[PDB]
From Swiss-Prot, chain A:
The keyword Cytoplasm applies. The lineage of its organism: Eukaryota, Metazoa, Chordata, Craniata, Vertebrata. It catalyses: S-ubiquitinyl-[E2 ubiquitin-conjugating enzyme]-L-cysteine + [acceptor protein]-L-lysine = [E2 ubiquitin-conjugating enzyme]-L-cysteine + N(6)-ubiquitinyl-[acceptor protein]-L-lysine; S-[NEDD8-protein]-yl-[E2 NEDD8-conjugating enzyme]-L-cysteine + [cullin]-L-lysine = [E2 NEDD8-conjugating enzyme]-L-cysteine + N(6)-[NEDD8-protein]-yl-[cullin]-L-lysine. This is E3 ubiquitin-protein ligase RBX1. The gene is RBX1. It comes from the Eukaryota. Keywords: Acetylation, Cytoplasm, DNA damage, DNA repair, Host-virus interaction, Metal-binding, Nucleus, Phosphoprotein, Transferase, Ubl conjugation pathway, Zinc, Zinc-finger. Its main location: cytoplasm. It is found in: Cytoplasm; Nucleus. Zn(2+) 1 binds at residues 21, 24, 51, 54. The RING-type zinc finger domain is essential for ubiquitin ligase activity. It coordinates an additional third zinc ion. A zinc finger (RING-type) spans 32-69.
From Swiss-Prot, chain B:
It comes from Homo sapiens (Human). Heterotrimer of an A (ELOA, ELOA2 or ELOA3P), ELOB and ELOC subunit. The elongin BC complex interacts with EPOP; leading to recruit the elongin BC complex to Polycomb group (PcG) target genes, thereby restricting excessive activity of the PRC2/EED-EZH2 complex. GO terms for biological process: positive regulation of proteasomal ubiquitin-dependent protein catabolic process; protein ubiquitination; protein-containing complex assembly; target-directed miRNA degradation; transcription elongation by RNA polymerase II; transcription initiation at RNA polymerase II promoter. GO terms for cellular component: Cul2-RING ubiquitin ligase complex; Cul5-RING ubiquitin ligase complex; cytosol; elongin complex; nucleoplasm; VCB complex. Belongs to the Elongin B family. Keywords: Acetylation, Host-virus interaction, Nucleus, Phosphoprotein, Transcription, Transcription regulation, Ubl conjugation pathway. Pathway: Protein modification; protein ubiquitination. The keyword Nucleus applies. This is Elongin-B. The gene is ELOB. Its main location: nucleus.
Curated annotation (Swiss-Prot), chain C:
Signal peptide: none annotated. GO terms for cellular component: Cul2-RING ubiquitin ligase complex; cytoplasm; cytosol; mitochondrion; nucleoplasm; nucleus; ubiquitin ligase complex. GO terms for molecular function: death receptor binding; metal ion binding; ubiquitin-like ligase-substrate adaptor activity. Keywords: ANK repeat, Apoptosis, Cytoplasm, Metal-binding, Nucleus, Repeat, TPR repeat, Ubl conjugation pathway, Zinc. It comes from the Eukaryota. This is Protein fem-1 homolog B. Widely expressed. Highly expressed in testis. Weakly expressed in other tissues. The chain holds residues 472 to 627 of 627 of the full protein. Substrate-recognition component of a Cul2-RING (CRL2) E3 ubiquitin-protein ligase complex of the DesCEND (destruction via C-end degrons) pathway, which recognizes a C-degron located at the extreme C terminus of target proteins, leading to their ubiquitination and degradation. The C-degron recognized by the DesCEND pathway is usually a motif of less than ten residues and can be present in full-length proteins, truncated proteins or proteolytically cleaved forms.
UniProtKB/Swiss-Prot annotation, chain D:
This is Elongin-C. Keywords: Host-virus interaction, Nucleus, Transcription, Transcription regulation, Ubl conjugation, Ubl conjugation pathway. Coiled coil: none annotated. Ubiquitinated by the DCX(AMBRA1) complex, leading to its degradation by the proteasome. It comes from Homo sapiens. It is found in: Nucleus.
Length: 75, 96, 156, 96, 82
């Protein structure tokens, strides 16, 4: 079989491998909840990129990733 | 997407093909681009004859070996077969 | 345009394009902070439309592309970082040329996001690969090449 | 569809026209008077560049056509030390 | 089913807005009474949805576990941060 003509829809998104900051549940383009009213993005060794303030508070609480069980580190 | 450097004396042809495909259409396309009868072309891979129905991926070169870089030293000859006298490329000058 | 065709340079060779690209460019502590943020994609586009030397180098040899890749906030203002690299490459910057330390902007990217954007925007040329091979092997190229190509070996 | 690139030292290199229009100078040579529209030969005489550098620019033509925008893990193109500074001048002449 | 989840998709969206609103208030004066904060967050989140008293109370407890807010040791009604 073949097709004479086709119609499509496509959801373009930026090519960043990370999607969201899973602390404040805010997209990483915008600012964290601690930071909106007044930031930098901190990556991880386990392909974990979140907000700087959120990561700082989380590591002040515990040295564990918020989704898996692995020791946090900077880049 | 296998790549080949089909050589015959001075003449050299750079050809793209598929991993699993016979040499029949290879001989037909070199016939089309060489403007000569098709039956006299005989491909040599390091100076040995190969089957006319066997796929070229299994012949000794694959897409991992025959890259867009230096593909293969595939020689070609025409029946008058002619002796394989593939002219090598000119030697680079003596650098200081 | 008139200011660009005087080639204004700071102490460290920064042209008028480099400072609009740089993130360390000082913005005054007064009300200028609210409106003037460097890097700015509109200023870079305006300067390139007005004829800024997109391949100009500073004292360290870093071109306009070498400074935008070193930007340390690739995701917070990715809209800014994307458009300036598009403008720099479309204006005719070399996505391969090296500074005084022989460091390609891919090597001086220090950021995955900028590296991905630049690798997307690179256009491959045999002249660039050959000149990179010449520079890497330290081949004596003086008085063996065109004079216009000596510069090309100089930065590639 | 297929163009022929005669080197200085006699060697004839045949690559696709789509592959050989990625260099500006060859595109200019094919256009103009004496385009020789036989649709299969389109010969060009490179009386200056030797055989090895012409072979390398043909490999580069294939390499660029294959990797024009794909395969972000781009393989390195193997410039020998003895072919550089003579492939560089050839690439400048061809405006690759 | 699709209508129900979209009514529940905004439920997670307004919890994130309530947490953002509570933190935004808590970084301007750094301490408020428990009853005084509820009327303040409702006033800010008023052009959008009207938050129920039970939902904001749950958002305080979630933010306590997130260590953005914490009850003061001197007075449990007062809210500090950590
Ligand atoms: Zn966050
Ligand atoms: Zn922040
Ligand atoms: Zn993690």
């Amino acid at each position: 079989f073949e097709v004479k003509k086709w119609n499509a829809v496509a959801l373009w998104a930026w090519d960043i491998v990370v999607d969201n900051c899973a602390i404040c549940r805010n997209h990483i383009m915008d600012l964290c909840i601690e930071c909106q009213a007044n930031c930098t993005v901190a990556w991880g060794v386990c392909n974990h990129a979140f907000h700087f303030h959120c990561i700082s508070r989380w590591l002040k609480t515990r040295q564990v990733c918020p989704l898996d069980n692995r020791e946090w580190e900077f880049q | 997407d296998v790549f080949l450097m089909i050589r015959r004396h001075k003449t050299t042809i750079f050809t793209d093909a598929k991993e699993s495909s016979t040499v029949f259409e290879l001989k037909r396309i070199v016939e089309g681009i060489l403007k000569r009868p098709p039956d006299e072309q005989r491909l040599y891979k390091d100076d040995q004859l190969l089957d006319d129905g066997k796929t070229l991926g299994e012949c000794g070169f694959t897409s991992q070996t025959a890259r867009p870089q230096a593909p293969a030293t595939v020689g070609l000859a025409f029946r008058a077969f002619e002796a394989l006298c593939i002219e090598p490329f000119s030697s680079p000058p003596e650098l200081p | 345009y008139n200011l660009i065709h005087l080639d204004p340079r700071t102490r460290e060779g920064f042209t008028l394009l480099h400072l609009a690209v740089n993130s360390n460019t000082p913005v005054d502590d007064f009300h200028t902070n609210d409106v003037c943020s460097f890097p700015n994609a509109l200023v870079t586009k305006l300067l390139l439309d007005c004829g800024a030397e997109v391949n100009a180098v500073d004292n360290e040899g870093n071109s306009a592309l070498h400074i935008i890749v070193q930007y340390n906030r690739p995701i917070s203002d990715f809209l800014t970082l994307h458009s300036i690299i598009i403008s720099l490459v479309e204006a005719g910057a070399h996505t391969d040329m090296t500074n005084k330390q022989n460091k390609t902007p891919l090597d001086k990217s220090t950021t995955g996001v900028s590296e991905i954007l630049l690798k997307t925007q690179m256009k491959m040329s045999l002249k660039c690969l050959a000149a990179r091979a010449v520079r890497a092997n330290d081949i004596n190229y003086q008085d063996q090449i065109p004079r216009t190509l000596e510069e090309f070996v100089g930065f590639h | 569809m297929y163009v022929k690139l005669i080197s200085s030292d006699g060697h004839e290199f045949i690559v696709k026209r789509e592959h050989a229009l990625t260099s500006g100078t060859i595109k200019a040579m094919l256009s103009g008077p004496g385009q020789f529209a036989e649709n299969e030969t389109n010969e060009v005489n490179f009386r200056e560049i030797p055989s090895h550098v012409l072979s390398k620019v043909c490999m580069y033509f294939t390499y660029k056509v294959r990797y024009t925008n794909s395969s972000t893990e781009i393989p390195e193109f193997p410039i020998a030390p003895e072919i550089a500074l003579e492939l560089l001048m050839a690439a400048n002449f061809l405006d690759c | 089913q699709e209508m129900e989840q979209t009514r529940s998709a905004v439920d997670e969206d307004r919890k994130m807005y309530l947490q953002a609103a509570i933190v935004r208030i808590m970084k301007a004066r750094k301490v408020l009474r428990h009853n005084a904060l509820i009327q303040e967050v409702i006033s800010q989140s008023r052009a959008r949805f009207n938050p129920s008293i039970s939902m904001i109370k749950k958002c305080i407890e979630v933010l306590i576990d997130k260590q953005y807010i914490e009850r003061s040791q001197a007075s449990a009604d007062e809210y500090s941060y950590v």
